[PDB]
Symmetry: C3
Subunit: 103 residues, 3 copies
Amino acid sequence: PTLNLFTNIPVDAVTCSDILKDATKAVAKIIGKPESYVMILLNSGVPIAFAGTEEPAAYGELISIGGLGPGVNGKLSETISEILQIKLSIDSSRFYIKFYDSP
Amino acid sequence: PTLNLFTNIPVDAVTCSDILKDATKAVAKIIGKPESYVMILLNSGVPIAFAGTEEPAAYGELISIGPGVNGKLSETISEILQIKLSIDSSRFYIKFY
Amino acid sequence: PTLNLFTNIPVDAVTCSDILKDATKAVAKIIGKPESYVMILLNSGVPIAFAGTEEPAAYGELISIGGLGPGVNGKLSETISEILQIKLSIDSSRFYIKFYDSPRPFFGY
Ligand SMILES: [Ca+2]
Ligand SMILES: [Ca+2]
Ligand SMILES: [Ca+2]
Ligand SMILES: [Ca+2]
Ligand SMILES: [Ca+2]
Ligand SMILES: [Ca+2]
C-alpha cells in the first residue's frame, strides 16, 4: 500500500521521519500487510487552501490492492489523523484522506 | 472536492494565495457548494516535460467531484493559471472515479 | 499519458531535464502515442519511507486513458526503473509504480 500525504506545514526532517515511521506501522498493522509492501510519502510545504483559509491542513491518498472497507478505513483514518494532530497540530477537520481499493 | 495542482513555474507566496483563492471561488461556484467543501493544493517548482518541452505547464488532479462541471471547471482553472502564471499548456485528470 | 514521479533524493536541474527527456521518449515509444500526449513530472526532495527505511526510493503514477495492453505495464515499469537506476542510483527494488486506467479522457488546454 501507499500513503501519499500533502501538507502546507513546512515539516522539519526529524518530525518527517517520525511521521513516516508512525504511518508505516499504522498502515501495515491495520490493513494487515508486511512493512516491506508499505510506502509513505510526505510532501510538505505545499500551499493548501481549505474552507477558504490557508490554516494548517493536509490531504492524503491511501491506495491498497484489497484489504480496505468499512472495518478498516475508519481505523486508518482515525489513526493517521491522530499522527498528524500530535506531530503537526493539524485539526482532524482540516485533514482529508481519500481511500482507494486498487484493482 | 480536492484539486491537486502541479506546475513547473516557481510561484511566489502572494500569487499562490491569489490562485488558491481564485480557484476556491471558481470551484465553489461551478459545483454549487460552499467553500468549506473545497480544498486546493499548489505544488509549484515541480519540473514538467509536456509534448517534449519544459515550457510552462500545469497538471491538475480532481478528487471527489453535476455533469459538464468537470469541463467548465478544468477550463476555468486552466484560464486562471494562464492569467496568473502565463501557463499556456495544462492537463486535468478526474481521479478515482 | 502522464507519469507523475516522486523521489526522496534531491535532483539537480540538469539531471532532472535528462530524466524528463528520457522518460518522455520511453513512454512515447512503449505506449505508441506521439510525444505531444506525454507529460512527465518529477517531484524531488520528497521524504519517503519504503519497507520501513528512508534509503533512496521513488513512487510513480502512470495514468493512461483506457489502460495498456497485456505486458505493456511491466515493460513500462522496467524501463522507468532503469531510468531511475541510471540517473539517480535508486535500486529497482525501491521503485513503486501504480498504473491508472482512466475510463474517460483528460481535459487538456
Ligand atoms: Ca498493496
Ligand atoms: Ca471491512
Ligand atoms: Ca474534498
Ligand atoms: Ca457526469
Ligand atoms: Ca494522452
Ligand atoms: Ca493515454
